[PDB]
Each structure stands twice: as C-alpha cells, then as structure tokens.
C-alpha cells in the first residue's frame, strides 16, 4: 500500500418493503446554507513566523518598525473586513478606534532573537565575523 505525503520532505429470494426515495421533507434552515456557513468557520487561522529564524539563521519578514507594522496591520485587516459583506467602507473597524493604543507592538523582521537590529542579516554577520580572522600560505 502507498499513501502520498502532503508536504515536501527531507529527501431473487425477497425484496423487502419500507424503503423509498420520495424526499418529501425539505431542510428548514437549509442544509446547503449551513454547509457554506460551516465551511468558512472550519478553517484554522494562519500563523505568522515574523521574527522567527529560518533554517539558514536570519529572521524572515519585512523591515518596517514594529508599531507602524501594528497600525497598518490593523488597517489591512479593516480593508479585508470591508470585502466581506461588500461595502465601500467597513463597519466593524479595527483601526480608527476611539481608544489610544499607541504602545502596541507586533512581530516583524526588524529585530532578531538576540535583541539587536536586523539591517544586516545574521548569516552575513556570522560570515564577516569568521572571515575577519584568516591567514594564508607564506
């Protein structure tokens, strides 16, 4: 037996009564509508791996500041909110709330897990650290 992987890996007696096919009863809330509504809630949410390292060593993601990332992150989620229940402007907004939330932070590739900045990736920093100290033949 073989089962495929989803991800990419490392390498004439009787004829009884009772049965019928008439289908008199119809679904009162509607089975197809409840199917289509249950589909969207069935989905697990996405992750973010922002600030987390890859295999090579650097933190993946953008270069934008953390709070600016949180603000336009909420604005992009408001723009996504506007597309469902199609309107010009969204009604249930995430940005432009009446509350001052200015000390909020979300993850981005500006930082590493050490604490320092990430204008230069960790792979090139390690490469220059080990290449500052070499010596050749006579």
């Amino acid at each position: 037996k073989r089962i495929p992987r989803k991800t990419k890996g490392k390498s004439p007696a009787t004829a009884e009564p009772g049965t019928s096919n008439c289908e008199h009863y119809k679904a009162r809330p509607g089975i197809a509508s409840v199917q289509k509504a249950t589909e969207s809630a069935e989905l697990p949410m996405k992750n973010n791996d922002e600030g987390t390292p890859d295999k090579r060593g650097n933190t993946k993601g953008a270069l934008v500041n953390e709070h600016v990332e949180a603000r336009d992150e909420a604005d992009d989620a408001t723009k996504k909110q506007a597309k469902d229940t199609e309107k010009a402007k969204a009604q249930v907004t995430y940005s432009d709330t009446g509350i001052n939330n200015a000390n909020e932070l979300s993850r981005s590739g500006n930082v590493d897990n050490e604490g320092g900045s990430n204008q230069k990736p960790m792979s090139t920093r390690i490469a220059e650290a080990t290449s500052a100290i070499v010596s050749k033949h006579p």
Binding site: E16, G18, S20, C22, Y25
Partner: protein, 98 residues
C-alpha cells in the same frame, strides 16, 4: 427516551422503554405522533416489515386528524397496504397527510 439497538447473530433488534427496558419488535406499543415525525425515515426501514407480515401493533396518539374514505366490494379480495404504507411514508417532520 428511545434508542434502537441492532440485532446480532440471530437476536431480535430491541428498542428502549421510558422505564429503561429493551423490548423486541412485537406487541402493543403507544407512540406520540411527534416521535414518529422526528424519526419518520429511520423508523420505516426498521418497523414496516414487522407490521405487514409480523405481529407488531402501534397506537399513535394524535388527538385530531383529517380523514379520507375508500370503499371496497365484499365479494372481492381487498388489501390496504398500498394506501397504508403510502401514509406511513409521507409522514414528515413538518406535515402529515390525511
């Protein structure tokens, strides 16, 4: 409270009482109409074979129901399954026919 356990290896399939008793598909039973309505399809395939040839009898408590009539000739043979099974099929969780 009613559940239906299947019969295995020749045993008769049983159904549960309000007193918590398992009885075979035989005898004198009393149903409310709403029970048969809410399970009108699963009970047909389990019960209709035992009403036609077997010895099972059901009193369905309804109260009020509209009726129809069909006359037959007492010199000729007459059977009522083609009307009775049509009614027992067309019972629906929303509606019943006459």
């Amino acid at each position: 409270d009613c559940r239906i356990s299947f019969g295995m290896n020749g045993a008769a399939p049983m159904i549960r009482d309000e007193t918590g008793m398992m009885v075979p598909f035989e005898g004198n039973w009393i149903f409310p109409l709403a029970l048969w309505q809410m399970n009108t399809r699963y009970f047909n395939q389990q019960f209709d074979a035992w009403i036609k040839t077997g010895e099972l009898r059901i009193r369905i408590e309804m109260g009020a129901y509209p009726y129809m009539l069909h006359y037959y000739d007492p010199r000729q043979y007459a059977n009522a399954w083609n009307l009775t099974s049509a009614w027992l099929e067309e019972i629906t969780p929303t509606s019943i026919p006459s």
